[PDB]
């Protein structure tokens, strides 16, 4: 039911055995990391500090990619979620420490490791570091950097309120089966000898979400976590070929418009979020830039039945202008 087939498993094994370049600033080598090695060494070194880890999973695009290549969401970034009840004792700091002392071991031979502090490793290879312990949320993040665009994010999550956006980013694929396979057998993976791997979805049933990813169907639940980007995210799927399922998008397609106007009330604000969204998602793709603004145009027009035009007319015009300025260039 949830078990990946030989194709899906092959896709998973490929991206977790890729060697990813992790570039460093200044007088530091480039780091060559295999995602499966990161999962092993981190989990072992964490265990040596008596810090427990429930499981390790894959998230977002890479998960959607292994389940369906043709979805087009693409495998661009690797996101590894370490599920660990990090309750007390400043365990969030020892996690920060363990990751940094794993980065030390992955260094190429020929580095005088004695001059390398944890802080110098941080300033060398780390791109982002986030820690959040507010209300129901307890989670940490260490984003490793790569000059070529790829982003190897290491997430340590005790508890997180909303773990998805739409149905096609909701899949999470456990990796413990795959890692145990590599230790147990010297024989390589075949169509008959491959591990049993279970896909899960943070939004309802895996079978429901898998059929949406396969038929290209835009679906979502709990829209109370919507944002101004929710409207933009909605169009990004729609222009890639995704379609809604015709089930009460009535309040939803108004909420995204309603929440995007609230989040971006100024005309200047809207033009900056739109111009930024175009280049940060469709660089060089001026055919997809145009077709995006056209899909965003029609969505805002037909969905926003809002009687007031102060937000509608001015918003609708910013889309028309940018569609033309993109076209005429």
């Amino acid at each position: 039911p949830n078990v990946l087939n030989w194709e899906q498993v092959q896709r998973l094994d490929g991206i977790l055995s890729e060697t990813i370049p992790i570039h460093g600033r200044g007088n530091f080598p480039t780091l060559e990391l295999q995602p499966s090695l990161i999962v092993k060494v981190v989990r072992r070194r964490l265990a040596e500090k008596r810090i427990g880890v429930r499981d390790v999973r894959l998230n977002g695009s890479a998960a959607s990619h292994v389940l369906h290549q043709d979805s087009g969401l693409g495998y661009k970034d690797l996101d590894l979620i370490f599920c660990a009840d990090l309750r007390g004792e400043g365990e969030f700091q020892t996690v920060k420490d363990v990751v940094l002392d794993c980065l030390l071991d992955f260094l190429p031979e020929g580095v005088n490791k004695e001059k390398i502090t944890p802080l110098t490793l941080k300033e060398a290879y780390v791109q982002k570091m986030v820690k959040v312990c507010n209300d129901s949320d307890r989670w940490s993040l260490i984003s490793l950097s790569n000059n070529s665009g790829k982003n190897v994010e290491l997430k340590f999550v005790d508890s997180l309120r909303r773990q998805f956006e739409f149905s096609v980013d909701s899949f999470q694929i456990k990796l413990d089966s795959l890692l145990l396979f590599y230790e147990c057998s010297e024989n390589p993976m075949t169509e008959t000898f491959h591990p049993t791997i279970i896909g899960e979805s943070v939004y309802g049933d895996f079978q429901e979400a898998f059929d949406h990813l396969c038929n290209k169907i835009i679906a979502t639940r709990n829209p109370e976590e919507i944002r101004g980007g929710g409207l933009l995210k909605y169009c990004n799927l729609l222009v890639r070929g995704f379609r809604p399922a015709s089930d009460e998008i009535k309040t939803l397609q108004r909420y995204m418009c309603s929440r995007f106007f609230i989040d971006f009330s100024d005309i200047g604000e809207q033009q900056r979020k739109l111009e930024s969204y175009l280049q940060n998602h469709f660089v060089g793709l001026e055919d997809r830039k145009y077709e995006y603004l056209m899909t965003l145009h029609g969505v805002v027009n037909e969905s926003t039945v809002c009687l007031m035009g102060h937000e509608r007319r001015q918003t609708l015009n910013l889309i028309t202008m940018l569609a033309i300025r993109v076209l005429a260039d």
């Binding site: 780390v126 982002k128 507010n134 980007g229 940060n280």
Partner: protein, 167 residues
């Protein structure tokens, strides 16, 4: 309650733009009179107040938005709203009781925050860019919410903000 964000992936003009953002904040407040670059502020907050928690909702939301994928050039624009929107808790808190201290006052405050942030009750709100050179060796944007020991020397009040400008 703890919220801590660090980013070492800023561009030279991303830093340079935020420094201008922080500088107007310095000019708008009353000014008090009685290598590395560091600029920012340290705002004291009280979490039992509506204002205290209403700020956190915006601070927590800004950090969440900073956690997005291609969200890097937007840092300068997202900060423009964050700290200059007086129609919002954080932009309003920085227009009231913002004070500019000379560097002889600011360095002790920076250094204690750097200590309190490294090793695992007063809720402090900080936003701190920093440059290490001539050339530019590293640019860092740190910003977070912490509960710790006294960084203020009894000289700061609740919802009083202190400016940092080190050169």
């Amino acid at each position: 309650v703890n919220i801590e964000f660090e980013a070492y992936s800023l561009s030279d003009n991303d830093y340079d733009g935020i420094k201008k953002l922080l500088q107007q904040l310095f000019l708008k407040a009353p000014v008090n009179t009685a290598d590395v670059e560091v600029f920012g502020f340290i705002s004291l907050l009280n979490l039992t107040e509506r204002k205290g928690t209403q700020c956190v909702e915006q601070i927590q939301e800004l950090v969440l938005r900073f956690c997005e994928k291609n969200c890097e050039k937007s840092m300068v624009e997202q900060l423009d709203k964050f700290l200059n929107d007086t129609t919002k808790p954080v932009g309003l808190l920085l227009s009231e009781r913002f004070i500019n201290v000379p560097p002889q006052i600011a360095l002790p405050m920076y250094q204690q925050l750097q200590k309190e942030l490294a090793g695992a009750g007063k809720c402090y709100f900080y936003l701190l860019i920093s440059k290490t050179f001539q050339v530019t060796a590293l640019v860092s944007l740190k910003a977070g919410l912490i509960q710790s020991r006294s960084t203020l020397s009894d000289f700061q009040g609740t919802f009083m903000t202190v400016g940092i400008a080190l050169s």
